[PDB]
């Protein structure tokens, strides 16, 4: 349990024992083959934040667990599986390399976070490209949606690994990739709203859109606030924030998507698949001929 | 120029000055806020390998440059743009953090490499999903192709960042993702061969398949041979090997793909788009009605 044992075994992760010499101008270290850096030893945050972070992580785990049990809708169960495995990794080695990368420039990069984005964010966007769940076509801009998002994560990760101005450059690059994703994602939500049958289906689509842009928009904000930004948030506080928006973006958004797909399925089962062309061009599900 | 200046300015990257004390049981270091690790100071390889690596990198750069000039075929120019930007980054900061990640466990992980895979490999697979270049449909297993590949890169990167058995676990996980990609990719090449018109088009498809599986299969092999494996290859030697198969997988494969798409285009322009159903189900381009 990393929540209990990290302070104990972090001595084995890297060098934590050192002696200051010559009025603090010299650091002396056991020649034991371990890497050393004072930056790595700095606090992750307060105990209150640490506690708050640990609570929400259990909640997400149970949420993901119940959702998995509850659950083609392969995209919904895939992200839940990743989220579950993530907690298992968090539970035992949250601040152990390389779940946290302690690099030579002093940075502490949460690779666990960025690796998860790589696994779940493209899948979420694939779901977005097929909100109705009807085989087999996707939008014309799904490939562009996927490429812009993966790139954005690469730039965000690279920005986190960097410092100073090079961090700024790769952040701004991720930002450019980000506006491309959102504009494309928005056009997908718009068409979806007019593709689904009028009624409750159009409500959840509106709800999924709100859940999407709010939650996803919070991530670059937290980046700026976190240790990889201007350090107003601790790494414990950064964890709290990410967990909250992980809840919205993956768990809640996934439930609504599944719920939306169920409604579509029951509709087509009852009324048949009947399309009315709407002016881009959209084939809208209707009830009567 | 990192090829010339790295030995000079690596003093500013991390601590390179230290004194052994007490019969080599104590290392003493300037208290200057820099990270220290003997593992980081180890040689990248021989000058012969370094020279060989630097030559092939220029070649790829010129190759990518000429290909860009030479060049919807958006996927071909996207990887060439990335490859060009990659060289520019290589030229100035090849062994500077975080192009190389110097982590607290002593590892030297080539993030530049893995970040590039994230950017170019999904795009290559998207191209693979649309070898004919005809709008707008892709295969049924493209989403599975993309997800399996991204995951595999995540596990490979995680494996490189790790050591010992956890490195082995994430390698084997990437391996499982890998066989999924190859089996799916193979089925795409098979259908493609029977979809394209009989003649030269079926030759290049066979050639692209050979280029694909040989080049892509070499990457996990080089992982095992490299510093992230059993260290038979130096980091300079690892660079040489990757550059050679970067040539095949991105540049050469991209040319053949573009060439294939040109042949398809000229065929449909001359003979029209005429399909004959072949038994999965494939709509085969033919010349006569
Ligand atoms: C479930 C996890 C999700 C949905 C994570 C999403 C992450 C982003 C939308 C990240 C965005 C960016 C940064 C953190 C920094 C650079 C700018 C962005 C937009 C690429
Ligand atoms: C242009 C660059 C390319 C095509 C890179 C491809 C990289 C791979 C196919 C990597 C494969 C793997 C490892 C390096 C280790 C774990 C096993 C694999 C298959 C995921
Ligand atoms: C998604 C997975 C991302 C990275 C997880 C890395 C966790 C590896 C923990 C190392 C174990 C150890 O330090 O002994
Ligand atoms: C920001 C700059 C671009 C990021 C996204 C690039 C995607 C290009 C592919 C789009 C497409 O042709 O479908
Ligand atoms: C928006 C800008 C985000 C980049 C963060 C700037 C500070 C760089 C740093 O903390 O080293
Ligand atoms: C949703 C909003 C997330 C806000 C995160 C703030 C963390 C507070 C812990 C200090
Ligand atoms: C694709 C790009 C992947 C990572 C490239 C990182 C290069 C950043 C170099 C840092 C510059 C410096 O050390 O001063
Ligand atoms: C190896 C284990 C699986 C890796 C690939 C998982 C892809 C699942 C999605 C496939 C699909 O439903 O189209
Ligand atoms: C195939 C196995 C690949 C994993 C490499 C095993 C050695 C681990 C190490 O070098 O620390
Ligand atoms: C294609 C094969 C790549 C082989 C790489 C071997 C590197 C040799 C440099 C020592
Ligand atoms: Zn720990
Ligand atoms: Zn350098």
Numbering used by the authors:
A (entry chain A), B (entry chain A): 39 to 109, 118 to 325, 333 to 342
What does the paper say about this structure?
One of the major families of such protein tools consists of microbial opsins, membrane proteins characterized by seven transmembrane helices that bind a chromophore, retinal, to a lysine residue of the protein through a protonated Schiff base linkage, RPSB3. In optogenetics, some microbial opsins such as channelrhodopsins (ChRs) and archaerhodopsin-3 (AR3), which function as light-sensitive ion transporters, are heterologously expressed in animal neurons to excite and silence them, and consequently to control animal behaviours by illumination with light.
The T198G/G202A mutant of C1C2 (C1C2GA) showed a blue-shifted absorption spectrum (λmax=455 nm) as compared with that of wild-type C1C2 (C1C2WT; λmax=476 nm), which was well predicted by the torsion at the C6–C7 bond. The atomistically designed structural model that created the blue-shifted spectrum was verified by solving the crystal structure of the C1C2GA mutant. We expressed, purified and crystallized C1C2GA as previously described, and obtained yellow crystals in the lipidic cubic phase under neutral pH conditions (pH 7.0). As expected, the overall structure of C1C2GA at pH 7.0 is almost identical to that of C1C2WT at pH 6.0 (root mean squared deviation of 0.66 Å over all Cα atoms), except for the protonation states of titratable groups, the amino-terminal (N-terminal) segment, and the retinal-binding pocket. The space where the C17 methyl group resides in C1C2WT becomes occupied by the methyl group of the alanine residue introduced by the mutation, and instead the C17 methyl group occupies the pocket formed by the threonine to glycine mutation. The C5=C6–C7=C8 dihedral angle changes from 177.7° to −31.4° (counterclockwise, positive), and consequently the retinal configuration changes from 6-s-trans to 6-s-cis. The atomic resolution structure is in good agreement with the calculated model, and it strongly supports the present design principle that the simultaneous double mutations at positions 198 and 202 in C1C2 (118 and 122 in HsBR, respectively) induce the rotation of the β-ionone ring, which leads to the significant blue-shift of the absorption spectrum. Notably, Asp40, His44 and His47 on the N-terminal helix coordinate a cation with Asp142 on ECL1. Owing to the strong electron density and the tetrahedral coordination by the His and Asp residues, this cation is most likely an endogenous Zn2+ ion.
